């Protein structure tokens, strides 16, 4: 099976995904023109398209942390995460021994 989703470039999606295509969500069977064979699936996609159409001065201490690179560092550098890093490594140390 193929996603066969209608891309903005006019070509059907050729991604080979078992269940879900990341750029188009769930994968449903489609014909040569990229139309879902199930009429219910066509209606659901139309509803999704309608929903999409409907849709001091200096950075404070909290505002400075509000970004991408800080968020990933906070998750990586955590008391529970570091302990889980050690705890996971302890279990392979038992396997190594």
- The site for DNA (CB under 7 A) is made up of 60, 79-80, 83
Interface with Zn ion, residue 13, by CB under 5 A: yes
Q: In the block, which residue shows the tokens 């404070």?
A: 60
Cβ closest to DNA, residue 79 vs residue 96? 79
| β-sheet bridge partners, residue 59 | none
Interface with Zn ion, residue 24, by CB under 5 A: yes
Q: Say how far apart CA 45 and CA 50 lie, in whole Å.
A: 9
The minimum distance between CB 19 and Zn ion, in angstroms, equals: 12
- Which residues, other chains included, contact 29 with Cβ-Cβ below 8 Å and sequence gap of 6+? 1, 36, 37, 38
| Known binding-site residue numbers | 3, 13, 21, 24
| Known binding-site residue numbers for Zn(2+) | 3, 13, 21, 24
């Amino acid at each position: 099976h193929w996603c066969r989703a209608p891309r903005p470039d006019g070509r059907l999606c050729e991604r080979q995904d078992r269940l879900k295509c990341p750029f188009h969500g769930k994968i449903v069977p489609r014909d040569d023109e990229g139309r879902p064979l199930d009429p219910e699936d066509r209606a659901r996609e139309q509803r999704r398209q309608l929903q999409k159409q409907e849709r001091p001065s200096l950075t404070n201490l909290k505002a400075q942390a509000d970004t991408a690179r800080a968020r990933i560092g906070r998750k990586v550098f955590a008391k529970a995460a570091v302990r889980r890093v050690v705890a996971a490594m302890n279990r392979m140390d038992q396997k190594k021994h």
